[PDB]
Amino acid sequence: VNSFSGYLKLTDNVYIKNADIVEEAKKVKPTVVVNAANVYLKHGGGVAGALNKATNNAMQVESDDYIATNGPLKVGGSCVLSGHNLAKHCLHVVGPNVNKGEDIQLLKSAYENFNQHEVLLAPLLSAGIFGADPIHSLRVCVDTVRTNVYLAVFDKNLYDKLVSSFL
Numbered sequence: 001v002n003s004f005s006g007y008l009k010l011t012d013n014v015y016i017k018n019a020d021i022v023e024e025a026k027k028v029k030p031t032v033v034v035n036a037a038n039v040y041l042k043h044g045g046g047v048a049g050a051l052n053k054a055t056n057n058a059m060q061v062e063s064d065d066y067i068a069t070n071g072p073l074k075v076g077g078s079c080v081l082s083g084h085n086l087a088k089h090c091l092h093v094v095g096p097n098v099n100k101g102e103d104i105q106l107l108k109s110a111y112e113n114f115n116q117h118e119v120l121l122a123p124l125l126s127a128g129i130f131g132a133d134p135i136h137s138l139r140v141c142v143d144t145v146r147t148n149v150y151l152a153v154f155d156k157n158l159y160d161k162l163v164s165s166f167l
């Protein structure tokens with residue numbers, strides 16, 4: 001039993017809810033919140049920009065030190081950093097950004113990072129400003145993640161289409 005509330009159960013391990021991931025993380029304080037990161041951990045917009053704003057830019061400061069030490073992430077890769085005031089940890093995961101021409105096949109690799117954590121609060125990878133079809137992203141999530149994932153879809157209209165169209 002966990003403290004996530006109001007989700008629809010898509011599968012044995014995948015749940016979905018119309019919610020602002022920022023407000024969800026603040027309420028639940030999950031062990032792991034997933035960020036829709038880029039390889040530079042530049043959290044300028046989308047989910048990343050909003051999560052960073054909620055940390056008063058502490059996420060960006062920590063991320064800049066991480067990049068200075070380690071260099072950029074790989075597309076499809078991840079790193080674990082602090083969750084600041086939002087969660088214990090933040091799993092920064094880089095899904096492909098179609099608006100950069102990045103290979104969409106890497107979306108499965110991106111979701112595989114979730115399997116290293118027993119329970120996660122997450123957005124749909126490569127959705128929003130990363131340019132992928134959120135319906136496809138949900139399918140890859142369900143077919144790749146085996147740990148317990150609580151998906152937050154900010155857009156209510158998009159949420160209804162994902163649920164109604166889910167096979």
Ligand SMILES: OC[C@H](Cc1ccccc1)Nc1ncnc2[nH]ccc12
Nearest residue numbers: 021046047050123124127128154155
């Ligand atoms: O896939 C991630 C989606 C992308 C999206 C945004 C808008 C319309 C359609 C798709 N973004 C978010 N999901 C959950 N919480 C969020 N907080 C801020 C952004 C955000």
Ligand SMILES: [Cl-]
Nearest residue numbers: 046047128129
């Ligand atoms: Cl977005």
